[PDB]
């Protein structure tokens, strides 16, 4: 560099070390003054990083160099100057640099290796030498560069690179070892699989180098390696098959060694568990995984109240978790997660081997652990455990009265967890065992923690319990809970209110009995602490719904005044109990809520208008932004962003409430429609960073319209704006799941708005979207390895609904646009994948409903007649509906196919009468009835397919036909066929039947409804003329 340039830059970069003022003045100077100067700047910084004897200036420059070299970008730099930079960087790397500075140089160097940059063979050469150096920092930094630039691994000869890694794993220095493993795993995460087979052979060397960490007592570094291995299991789990037992045994060995600090034990557990989430067939196929996993997690769950056998510290504290019981926490999460992926088929047996034993230990911690373990595994193993239910209770329930209060707590928990996981069956079956067990723990004989947890477990039970089942136990439950309500400890009171609330909600009308006593107790609590009052308001309004409006009106006025007070006064946890309560009052009050809207809606508007609160951010400026629970950072197109997740979640919550107020208030909500639609719903579709928002936006639309419609041009303006943005969203929406919501949204919009609600350019725009969606679905299904082991059906189901909706609103005229995507529809019809076939068949049936299709008759009847006798009942269903609809709307143009196939329909109609394909064969039945109407042996066949109970449109036709086959000793089958249809709520046919019964003796007539029980004879009486 020119000598002047140097001291200019030297001064500025020295201003960087320091204060805001001196350091911002330097920042300005650089960003304002320094495409004319970039290569000088780059050259300067690279020289500083390489040669400056000042640590701080050196570091700074290296970091700056890295930042500015991406921004440049490095590609657009003069070959002449790249070379100089590369050489000085390399010279600095190979000189005497402090460890931290070599790291930064390494990362700068990485910025100068790029596929389209001129070849840099000096780097390869310097790395090969450095890996052989006796200075650990040279070795570490070399693997680091191969971590950042993994493609360099491909550029080295295979017979050099393999020994490089084997040496890496084996190195004297732990830091070198960590860097080699990082680099090794990094390889897999940056290169295509076609390249993997080339380092894969090394996994054994890596695994074999593991026990050495334990020998050296270097378990903290073991944890780092376990973390790289965790990533490798996600990428290439199969690679570990057949060294499988050796990693399993090794992690077993480590987890059991309980004077290791926990990091190495918890990461080893994570390694174990992650296999089940990435290679379930593998873990299932070896008995040893399940066994080690269960054994190991049971041990860890024992690690509670350490050095505190009485649990003194725990009885005194609140019912929140002591998050300092880390290994215990990890163990239950693990057991849960594995159980979920492998199922009970695979782990009930090993689990129970160990439970039996620990249940009876004299170590309380083990009896506890057994409860917590069952409790963790229960969801996952539901499939098997749902039928070992009395056996479970026999083991669990004795401990309800265990000497030790934590075992008691433990027992309450299992009863709670199980009540949820085995619902609704367990409510029906075990109330006689469960409720008394729990109720007995409510008494003030027991400790605060246990009483509260028993009360907690009662919520779990109640969620899925019948009012009828709970009824005999209410008095007992209530009297006990009232005691806890008076407890002296905040948390006991709070749980008591919540338990009462949720019991009440289940009890419904059976709770009316208890209302007069409870409600003033509740009012007094309110008049007297945010969670208490919120939990109290929640309890009051849940009680209010359970008892109904009239009864709730005894205190509603006062309650409402307290709500208002609470809302407008000087925890954000309260805001929610308030919101949900107002909303619950509106479900109780019906139209009487309307006066309250001006209290309740304004705060919801504010929240529901939160903008996409985004920070276009920088690489380092992330990991710290990531610290916050309330924030998450993602990458859009390489360049990153910080999104305030909490705020966006809150927007959704508020939109949900706006949506339910609209749904219940209907016409009454009309005053808000324009505001919510334009300032909330619609802008929400452009929230590309949060799909909940986008979805809530779409579901709001038709509900808003329907509200304005019921009250009253603006409706049209709004609808036009809305439908347009939905349609345009169909082409640009990346998530198929959201795409489905838009279509469903349009269908609902169309049903609200009625006839011809869409314009011609809209219809064309909807077709491109439909086409893009059909295109992207085909391409995803043409997807499905050496290393690895309904959202599409649902989307297509909805697209069928939108197309039908659009056809109906246009009354056929959409057939013109429909021609453009016939190639799509055709490919589908003759693919193999049954889902695409069903889609196309269903579209086809819609086309025919609107004799102008002959154009195509020749193209799809061959496939339809195939489909008729497919193994797949959903295919037969779609096909027969098509044939039925052919005869109905296009009778002369399809007379030739319909009558031939008529025999096929008599055959398909005869597994037919099952639940699973009752659907299919009911359509066939209706299909033949349709044909017999459009154009005697056949009709007698048809009859032997009644009654029709599952499909509504089919049933509609068959009994219309049955009514014509009459008005223009089968008599008890005739009547029954009809009674069954009504009774099963599938579908004037009655008028025809009356006349038939007229033509019989009074005693013959009466004997038909000999068979029928009282409840359906109550209904029969109220059906007849």
For the sheet with most strands, the description reads:
3 strands, antiparallel
Q: Which CATH class of the largest domain is shown?
A: Mainly Alpha
Shape: globular
Task: Write down the CATH topology of the largest domain.
Answer: Leucine-rich Repeat Variant
> How many β-strand stretches?
3
Tally of alpha and pi helices: 54
Report the helical percentage: over 70%
Count of distinct structural domains? 2
Radius of gyration: 36 Å
PDB class: protein transport
Keywords: HEAT repeat, nuclear import, protein transport
Assembly: monomeric
Entry title: Crystal structure of Kap121p
Per-chain topology:
Layout lengths: L2 H14 L4 H13 L4 H14 L3 H17 L7 H16 L4 H12 L10 H11 L4 H13 L3 H4 L2 H11 L5 H17 L12 H6 L2 H5 L3 H17 L8 H13 L5 H17 L1 H5 L2 H14 L11 H4 L10 H34 L4 H14 L4 H4 L3 H8 L8 H17 L3 H18 L5 H15 L4 H19 L4 H18 L7 H13 L2 H18 L1 H4 L3 H12 L4 H18 L7 H11 L6 E3 L15 E6 L1 E5 L1 H21 L4 H12 L9 H21 L2 H19 L3 H18 L6 H22 L9 H20 L3 H5 L3 H8 L4 H16 L4 H15 L4 H17 L5 H14 L9 H17 L2 H7 L8 H16 L3 H13 L5 H10 L3 H5 L7 H8 L4
Antiparallel strand pairs: 1-3, 2-3
Helix pairs in contact: 1-2, 3-4, 3-5, 4-6, 5-6, 6-8, 7-8, 8-11, 11-14, 14-16, 15-16, 15-18, 16-20, 18-20, 18-21, 20-21, 21-24, 24-25, 24-26, 25-26, 25-27, 26-28, 27-28, 28-30, 29-30, 30-33, 33-35, 34-35, 35-37, 36-37, 37-38, 37-39, 38-39, 38-40, 39-41, 40-41, 41-44, 43-44, 44-46, 45-46, ...
GO biological process, one term: regulation of protein desumoylation
GO cellular component, one term: nucleus
GO molecular function, one term: nuclear localization sequence binding
């Amino acid at each position: 560099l020119p000598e002047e340039v140097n001291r200019t830059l030297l001064q500025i970069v020295q201003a960087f070390a320091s204060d805001n003022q001196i350091r911002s003045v330097a920042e300005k100077a650089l960003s304002e003054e320094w495409e004319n100067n970039i290569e000088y700047l780059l050259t300067f910084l690279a020289e500083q990083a390489a040669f400056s004897q000042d640590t701080t200036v050196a570091a700074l420059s290296a970091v700056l160099f890295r930042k500015l070299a991406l921004k440049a970008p490095i590609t657009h730099i003069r070959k002449e100057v790249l070379a100089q930079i590369r050489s000085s960087l390399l010279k600095g790397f190979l000189s005497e640099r402090a460890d931290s500075i070599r790291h930064k140089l390494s990362d700068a160097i990485a910025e100068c290796v790029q596929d389209d940059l001129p070849a840099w063979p000096e780097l390869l050469q310097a790395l090969i030498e450095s890996l052989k150096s006796g200075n650990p920092n040279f070795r570490e930094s070399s693997f680091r560069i191969l971590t950042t630039v993994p493609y360099l691994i491909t550029a080295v000869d295979i017979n050099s690179i393999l020994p490089i890694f084997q040496s890496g794993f084996t190195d004297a220095s732990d830091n070198v070892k960590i860097a080699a493993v990082t680099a090794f795993v990094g390889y897999f995460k940056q290169l295509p699989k076609s390249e993997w087979s080339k380092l894969g052979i090394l996994l054994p060397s890596l695994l074999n180098s593991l026990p050495r960490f334990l020998d050296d007592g270097k378990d903290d570094a073991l944890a780092s390696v376990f973390e790289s291995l965790i990533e490798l299991v996600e990428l290439a789990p199969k690679l570990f098959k057949d060294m499988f037992d050796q990693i399993i045994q090794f992690t077993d060995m480590v987890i059991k060694n309980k004077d290791l600090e926990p990091p190495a034990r918890t990461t080893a557990l994570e390694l174990l568990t992650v296999f089940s989430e990435n290679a379930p067939q593998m873990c299932k196929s070896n008995q040893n995984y399940g066994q080690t996993l269960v054994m190991v997690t049971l041990i860890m769950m024992t690690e509670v109240s350490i050095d505190d056998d009485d649990a003194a510290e725990w009885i005194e504290s609140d019912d929140t978790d002591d998050e300092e019981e880390v290994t215990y926490d990890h163990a239950r999460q693990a057991l849960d997660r594995v159980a979920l992926k492998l199922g009970g088929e695979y782990l009930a047996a090993p689990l129970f081997q160990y439970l039996q034993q620990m249940i009876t230990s004299t170590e309380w911690r083990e009896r506890f652990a057994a409860m917590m373990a069952l409790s963790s595994a229960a969801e996952g193993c539901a499939d098997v455990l749902i039928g070992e239910i009395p056996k479970i209770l026999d083991m669990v329930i004795p401990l309800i009265n265990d000497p030790h209060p934590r075992v008691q707590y433990g027992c309450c928990n299992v009863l709670g967890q199980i009540s949820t996981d085995f619902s609704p069956f367990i409510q029906r079956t075990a109330h006689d065992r469960i409720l008394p067990a729990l109720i007995s723990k409510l008494t003030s004989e027991c400790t605060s923690r246990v009483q509260t947890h028993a009360a907690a477990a009662l919520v779990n039970f109640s969620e899925f319990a019948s009012k009828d089942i709970l009824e005999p136990y209410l008095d007992s439950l209530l009297t006990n809970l009232l005691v806890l309500l008076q407890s002296n400890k905040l948390y006991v009171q709070e749980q008591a209110l919540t338990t009462i609330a949720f019991i009440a909600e289940a009890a419904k009308n059976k709770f009316i009995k208890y209302y007069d006593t409870l409600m003033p107790l509740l009012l007094n609590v309110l008049k007297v602490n945010s969670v208490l009052k919120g939990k109290c308001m929640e309890c009051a309004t849940l009680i209010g719904f359970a008892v109904g409006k009239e009864k709730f009106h005894e205190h509603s006025q006062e309650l409402i005044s307290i709500l208002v007070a609470l809302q407008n006064s000087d925890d954000d946890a309260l805001r929610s109990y308030l919101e949900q309560s107002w909303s619950r009052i509106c479900r109780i009050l019906g139209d009487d809520f309307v006066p309250l809207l001006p209290i309740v809606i304004p705060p919801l508007l504010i929240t529901a208008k939160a903008t996409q609160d985004v920070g276009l951010i920088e690489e380092e400026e992330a990991a710290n932004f990531q610290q916050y629970p309330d924030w998450d950072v993602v990458q859009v197109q390489g360049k990153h962003i910080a999104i305030h997740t909490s705020v966006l979640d809150d927007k959704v919550s508020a939109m949900e409430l706006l949506q339910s107020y609209a749904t219940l208030l209907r016409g009454q909500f009309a005053v808000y429609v324009k505001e919510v639609m334009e300032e909330i719903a619609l802008p929400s579709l452009d929230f590309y960073l949060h799909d909940g928002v986008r979805a809530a936006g779409a579901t709001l639309i038709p509900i808003l319209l329907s509200c304005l419609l019921a009250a009253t041009e603006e409706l049209v303006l709004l609808w036009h704006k809305a439908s347009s943005k939905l349609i345009g969203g169909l082409m640009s929406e990346p998530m198929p799941e959201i795409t489905q919501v838009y279509h469903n949204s349009l269908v609902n919009g169309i049903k609200v708005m009625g006839d011809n609600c869409l314009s011609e350019d809209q219809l064309a725009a909807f077709t491109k979207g439909v086409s893009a969606n059909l295109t992207d679905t085909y391409e995803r299904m043409q997807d499905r390895d050496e290393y690895n082991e309904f959202t599409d059906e649902d989307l297509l189901d909805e697209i069928n609904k939108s197309i039908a909706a659009v056809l109906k609103t246009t009354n056929g005229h959409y057939l013109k646009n429909l021609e453009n995507i016939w190639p799509m529809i055709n490919t589908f019809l003759l693919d193999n994948e049954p889902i695409l076939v069903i889609f196309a068949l269903v579209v086809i049936g819609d086309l025919i409903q609107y004799e102008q299709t002959a154009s195509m008759k020749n193209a799809f009847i061959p496939k339809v007649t195939e489909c008729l006798i497919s193994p797949d009942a959903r295919i037969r269903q779609a096909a027969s509906y098509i044939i039925g609809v052919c005869a109905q709307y296009a009778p002369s143009t399809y007379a030739d196919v319909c009558i031939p196939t008529l025999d096929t329909l008599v055959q398909i109609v005869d597994g037919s009468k099952l639940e699973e394909n009752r659907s299919s064969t009911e359509n066939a039945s209706a299909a033949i009835a349709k044909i017999l109407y459009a154009y005697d042996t056949y009709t007698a066949n048809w009859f032997k397919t009644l009654p029709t109970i599952t499909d509504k449109e089919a049933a509609s036709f068959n009994y219309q036909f049955l009514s014509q086959l009459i008005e223009n000793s089968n008599i008890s089958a005739v009547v029954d066929s009809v009674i069954q249809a009504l009774n099963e709520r599938s579908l004037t046919v009655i008028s025809s039947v009356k006349k038939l019964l007229g033509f019989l003796p009074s005693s013959d007539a009466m004997a038909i409804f000999n068979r029928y029980p009282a409840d359906i004879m109550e209904k029969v009486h109220k059906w007849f003329a």
